[PDB]
Amino acid sequence: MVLMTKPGTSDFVWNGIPLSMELNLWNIKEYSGSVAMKFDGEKITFDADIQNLSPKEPERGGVLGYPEFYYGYKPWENHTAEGSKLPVPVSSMKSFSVEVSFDIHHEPSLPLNFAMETWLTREKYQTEASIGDVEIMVWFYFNNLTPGGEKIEEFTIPFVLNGESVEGTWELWLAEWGWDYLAFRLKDPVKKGRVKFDVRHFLDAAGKALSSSARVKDFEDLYFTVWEIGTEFGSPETKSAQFGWKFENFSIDLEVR
Ligand SMILES: OC[C@H]1O[C@@H](O[C@H]2[C@H](O)[C@@H](O)[C@H](O)O[C@@H]2CO)[C@H](O)[C@@H](O)[C@@H]1O
Numbered sequence: 001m002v003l004m005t006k007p008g009t010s011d012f013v014w015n016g017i018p019l020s021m022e023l024n025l026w027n028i029k030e031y032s033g034s035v036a037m038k039f040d041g042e043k044i045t046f047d048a049d050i051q052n053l054s055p056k057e058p059e060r061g062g063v064l065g066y067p068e069f070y071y072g073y074k075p076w077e078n079h080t081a082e083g084s085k086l087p088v089p090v091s092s093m094k095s096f097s098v099e100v101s102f103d104i105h106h107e108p109s110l111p112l113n114f115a116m117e118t119w120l121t122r123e124k125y126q127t128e129a130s131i132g133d134v135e136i137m138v139w140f141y142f143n144n145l146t147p148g149g150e151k152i153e154e155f156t157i158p159f160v161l162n163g164e165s166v167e168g169t170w171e172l173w174l175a176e177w178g179w180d181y182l183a184f185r186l187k188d189p190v191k192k193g194r195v196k197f198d199v200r201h202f203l204d205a206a207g208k209a210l211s212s213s214a215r216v217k218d219f220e221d222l223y224f225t226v227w228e229i230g231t232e233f234g235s236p237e238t239k240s241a242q243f244g245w246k247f248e249n250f251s252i253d254l255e256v257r
Helices: 199-209
Strands: 002-004 008-014 017-023 032-039 043-051 068-072 093-106 112-121 134-143 150-161 164-176 180-186 192-198 226-230 241-256
Touching (some): 002 008, 002 017, 017 032, 017 241, 093 134, 093 226, 112 241, 164 199, 180 199, 192 199, 226 241
Antiparallel strands (some): 002 032, 008 017, 032 043, 043 241, 068 226, 093 192, 112 134, 112 226, 150 164
8 A cells, every 4th residue: 555645756566566656746846736646456546636837847848747657667766666677678678568457537628648658778777868868658648748859650559458459550759859759659549448568569669760860879789677657747838737547457577588
């Protein structure tokens, strides 16, 4: 049982899997209202009803926070729950399946998404990402929110949605900021459902997308550090946010060559 009502990180174990939950409001200068994130052994829930919001780093634009949970090592926080099998070199990953059920609710106009991501780093345990590293996101849902940078292509990547084998069409957005940002955004966003997919398909498309970059070199030698699952929300214009979610039936399976 884990309960947090302010920003912070806590570890937990879900069906034997060591994980970390972060009530991540990294780009929020200050807020009024309440946030509550909880793990009860069977589900992780998050609820927010906050106001008086403004960006911590205004000039970078983009979102305000990212309440999430993750498996592995999150560089920015020098943190991992114990017993984690990540990070591992991208070249060593044969497959990395992620499965989770989700139910996201939100006031109608809120910029928000259901996004999962990883950070690929040159060194195994960096404490930040910079030039030469990569941030790769996978968005299964979005509302009044587009990824950063611009769309550079589309990839058809399969996955199991609510128990059925489907093919998703994913727009790939790339931005060269302090690191390389890549976001795969599903054309038919899903607000509630269950998905199972292999992160390897996204790592394969990302590596190809960057095969001529002068910034990202030797993609396959980078370390796949973590797998975060959460909901980014907000924009420089967002003054308040009312939303919440429930994640259940979580599991991952890393298979290394
Ligand atoms: O900038 C450090 C900050 O990054 C947070 O991840 C951001 C990422 O920087 C941004 O490019 C993307 O649009 O959104 C993600 C998630 O909101 C990270 O979660 C923080 O821990 C870190 O302090």
